[PDB]
Amino acid sequence: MHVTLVEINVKEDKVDQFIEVFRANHLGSIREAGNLRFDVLRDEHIPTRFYIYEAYTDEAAVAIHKTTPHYLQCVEQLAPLMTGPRKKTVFIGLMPG
Amino acid sequence: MHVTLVEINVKEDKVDQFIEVFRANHLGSIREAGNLRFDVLRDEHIPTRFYIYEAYTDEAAVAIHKTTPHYLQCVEQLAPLMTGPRKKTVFIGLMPGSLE
Ligand SMILES: [Cl-]
């Protein structure tokens, strides 16, 4: 089980659009055969800092995710909404397992 | 969702005891009606660094969790296991939730 936590910093005046983009990504991603989690989180104190907790069965499912129309559209639409590059931390799942 | 991520560094010779403790915490927690996630993760590279990702429906459910035998056994047994103190991050859970 492959997990990633991705930090995204969003332009204050674009939060509404960011939420729309991630609603579409979340909806598509939770429907994928190899998806296990797709949680959208906010920083406890920074209103424009979000974290996406995504987990997939394995790295093959991650690769599949990155081929999907919803992921590719999100990557496109997210780019201008952000104040800087995404930061990603990878983890390996132990439980469930 | 009330969400937290906790980082724990475990003494090399205590990793097995850490797994025993977290297995029981994981099992009991996923049997809590108010629990939504209890994922036990490990660092990509550092063999003794673990993370626990936990989510609960609300603050009452977090509080319930902290009264359970499985949590309390974890708390008791945890100090002899670690090299230094745990680090905890709290997150605001937006999806799944009304924002979906
Ligand atoms: Cl000892």
Select the residue from B92, B98, B99, B100 to test the A interface by mutation, using most A Cβ atoms within 10 A. B92
| Residues of A with Cβ-Cβ distance to B91 under 8 angstroms | 41-44, 51
Q: B97 — alpha (psi -120 to 50), left (phi > 0) or beta?
A: left
Joined tokens for residue A39: 């949680």
With 0-12 / 13-18 / 19 or more C-beta atoms within 10 angstroms meaning exposed / middle / buried, residue A84 is exposed
Q: Compute the nearest-CA separation of B95 from chain A (Å).
A: 5
Closest residue on chain B to A37 (Cα) = B37
- Residue A90 structural domain: 2-97
Kindly determine whether residue B93 and residue A39, on different chains, have CB atoms separated by under 8 Å: yes
Method of determination used here? X-ray
Give resolution in angstroms.
Answer: 1.8
Question: Smallest Cβ distance to B39: which of A22, A90, A93?
Answer: A93
B53 close contact with A: CB closer than 8 A = yes
Split into its structural domains, chain B has a count of: 1
CB contact under 8 A, A92 and B51: no
Q: Reduced to 3 states, what is the DSSP secondary structure of residue B92?
A: strand
Hey, how many other C-beta atoms are within 10 angstroms of the C-beta on B96?
16
For chain A, what is the HEC assignment?
A: CEEEEEEEEECHHHHHHHHHHHHHHHHHHHCCCCEEEEEEEEECCCCCEEEEEEEECCHHHHHHHCCCHHHHHHHHHHHHHECCCCEEEEEEEEECC
Strand partners, A53: A5, A39
What is the separation, in whole angstroms, between the first and last Cα of chain B?
Answer: 12
How many helices (DSSP H) and strands (DSSP E) are in chain B?
Answer: 3, 4
Residue B49 Cα, gap to closest chain A Cα (Å): 10
Q: Does B39 touch chain A (CB under 8 A)?
A: yes
Between CA B47 and CA B9 the distance in angstroms is: 9
Q: Report the CATH number that the domain containing residue A67 is assigned in CATH.
A: 3.30.70.100
Q: Cα separations (Å) of B36 from A18, A48, B14, B61?
A: 25, 25, 28, 10
